[model samples]
Structure formats: C-alpha cells, structure tokens
Target: MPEETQTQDQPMEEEEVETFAFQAEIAQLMSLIINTFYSNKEIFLRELISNSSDALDKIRYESLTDPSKLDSGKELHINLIPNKQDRTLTIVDTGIGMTKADLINNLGTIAKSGTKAFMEALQAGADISMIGQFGVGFYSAYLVAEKVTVITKHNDDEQYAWESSAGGSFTVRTDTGEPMGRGTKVILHLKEDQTEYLEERRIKEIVKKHSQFIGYPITLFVEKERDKEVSDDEAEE
Candidate 1:
C-alpha cells in the first residue's frame, strides 16, 4: 500500500534493458513443468517459498563465513504480498540476491551451469548451492502466473528486473523502481482462473502444508479487519 509494487503499470523505457530468448532446454523445462504440475498449481507458492528459503540459507551461510556480506546478519524473511486489485502476488525475500549474469545463467540457461554437480552433491549429502537448481523450481511459477517479474539486487551488482510470460523468451532490465536494500522480490501476475491464489486462507493453507520445514519465517501481508465485534457474552458479564 505504501510503495509501487506493480511493474506492468510502469513505463518500459530504460537505459539498460536486455532481452533474450529462452534457450531450447529452458523452453522444454517450462513446458515439462506445466504438463507435469498442472493439477498441482498450488505447488507454485511452495516451490517459490522454498527457493527463497534456499536464498535465505545461502546468505546466512555466507554471513557465518564472513561478516562483510551485504546481507550479513540481516533479518531474513519471506513476505507474501497479495494485491487483489492488481491480480498480483509478490513474494519478497531478504537474501543473497542475483547478479545480472546470475539472473540469465540461473533462470535462462539452466543446463549451461553446473547443474550436474549440484545434483551429484545433493546425492552425496553435501550442501549443494541452491542457485544451481533455481531454474527447476522457478518454472513452477508459470503454472499459475501468466507473467512473472523478478526484481533483485545483489551484494556485488546493481538492481535488475527479469520478466517473462513463460513465452519463448524473457526480458531483463534495470529496475526503475525503488532500489531494494538487498534481496529479491518475485511478482506473479496471476491468471484469471487462479485468483484463488490471492486469498489469504488458501495461501496460508498452502504454506502450512508444504512450508512447515523451512527454517526461516514465511509471512503473508494481510489486511486486518478493523474493530469487529468483541465477545458479546463477556461484554454482558
């Protein structure tokens, strides 16, 4: 309510905007997720939350190793901001955000990265870098979102916006909005049929179902009802 959260409403003119076609493998990945998880669209929120949890964990791990990390000792959290009027659900996390190269590498060219190593380390029970597998879970966003906009600022890079409608390509541009301190915010432009995802009850239920294991706090911005009736019986007594 206090800031500009909608990207679609913003003008597109920018000094440093770059757009790229989705790699062949990335397109296949999106189609595969849609085909496989169509029935479980709710998993989108869970997958996204887990991704944020991974980021939060990464920053925490980094902070432990060095005190100068941008978000070192920062209060980490995941805030689910639902704007019914705009039909958008924004998931924000205070974590180690993506650099410009990282946005394209992790989100665009999933196969070009050290994905096999990530899997191998996972099987070996080592702490695998979650960024390597970020593409997999991110595709889940397309299950319910017609368009997904990602705004991130890293410790070493300037703020950038990555957006795609799950088309054959995505666009990355310099974020013209308020500069995030250090983190990522994912705005999902929900499909008309998926508006139920905008409900607090449904989101809370989904989070309760799959996000219970995340070590960090996952919170939703809710509009509290003002001055409803108190306990009538207690008032009478």
Candidate 2:
C-alpha cells in the first residue's frame, strides 16, 4: 500500500499538488493506442461506461457490509455532461472513488502484464468485464481526448483532481470546487477532430450501441432547446 493513506482517515484538506510520470509500460501503451486505434475510437465511451458500472457495483457491495459508507445520503448514479463551449465531455459517478494512494497507484501504474493481450482482444470484440481487470481500458480516453481530468471523492478520503494531457506526466491536487459527496468525475477534453462527441445525438448513439444495458442509469446532461416562437408578423408573410 502507498503511504498516501497517512492523512486520508482525517480527510484534512491537502493544499499541495503532486505530479508524476506515467508508469513505463503505461506510457508506451498510451502512444500505441492513440496512433493505432484508427477505426472506431468511440470505444472510449463504452470503456468508460463499463468502468463506472463496475465502480458503482463495487460500492454497492461494500455498503451492504458497512452501511456507514453511504452516510452522505448520496444516491448511486452516473451522469454524462457535455459542454460544446469547453470542448469537454464529463462523466460523473456517485460510487466508490479513489484515495490519494489509489489515484497514484491506479492512475500511475499498469498491471505489468496482458496489455498486449488486451489490445488484441479489442479487434475481436473484447469481453467487457475482462477489460476492467486489465486496467488499460481507462487509457482509451486518449483515443479521442487530448486531456483528461478525473475528480473523485472516496468515503475514506478527501476529494482530489487528477489531470493529464496524455503527454508523459499527470497532476493530482485537492479539488477546491464544489464538494463531491462520494464518487468520481472524469472530464475529457476532446481533440479538435473529436469534438463530434460533444453532441447529444452522437453520445446517445454511442451509448445505445454499447452500454444501454449496463446496471446503472447514465443521465446525460442535455441542453433543452427552446421552441421557436412564431410572431404574428411571420404569419403575415
């Protein structure tokens, strides 16, 4: 286990920001996926959705034994927020999030094996559950995103923001924005060519294709368009 747990139990707000390079294997794998996944990069949504589902399920199982985990009175759910102005797509989930150590270990390192096997399985339609164990599924975000920001709050720890631009390093710091009760929020800053993902129609198409049956309800933030009012002057025309 990492020493980061030293202050987690108290949840003291940490003012410090830490940054580190991605694990050797993970760095190499990221480059390979971005350049090689030429067809169907939309797989990123499916991969992310699958991850949230597992996270939600894990938290549910945990709360059953330790009811205090849900003391925040937060409901379990996932939300997808797309902002065209910001060129970002955000996935929010109220589930088991990450501690500082988990943010370091989980996002910083790879499993050290099966990355090659996992990439190969993608072409043949990889098993969804199997992708979770491999851990590289999260990296698929780089396929269409130039930067990724993950804001998370675990029951046992304070909320933190982890961000990276798919370069060589990532930064993690205390999130001073709105308090996250308990969950994870992954924000993808889409590449210029991938801005199509910022549209509701496209996101809906992709989700309906892959994760329509996933256990959690994925609420996508939609901008309701106001009805066009026809003035009497227009009727005269």
Candidate models: Cα lDDT each: 0.62, 0.64
Q: Which 10 consecutive positions of candidate 1 have the poorest summed lDDT?
A: 127-136
Q: For each candidate, what TM-score against the reference?
A: 0.66, 0.69
**Highest-scoring model, lDDT:** 2
- What value of lDDT does candidate 2 attain over all alpha carbons? 0.64
Per-residue alpha-carbon lDDT of model 2 for 34-127, expressed as tens digits? 6665454555555666666787778888888888746775466777788766777777766665556765566544545656666567657764
Candidate 1 TM-score over all chains jointly:
0.66
Candidate 1: residue 67 Cα off by (Å): 3.1
The Cα RMSD in angstroms, rounded to one decimal, for candidate 2 relative to the true structure is 8.4
Error of 2 at 156 (Å): 7.6
Compose the digit string of candidate 1's lDDT tens values, residues 66-174.
6664545344677888876677787777666455666555555555445466456546764312432455445545655678777776555577777777656767666
- Model 2 alpha-carbon drift over 4 Å, by segment: 1-16, 22-25, 37-40, 68-73, 112-133, 153-156, 179-183, 208-216, 228-237
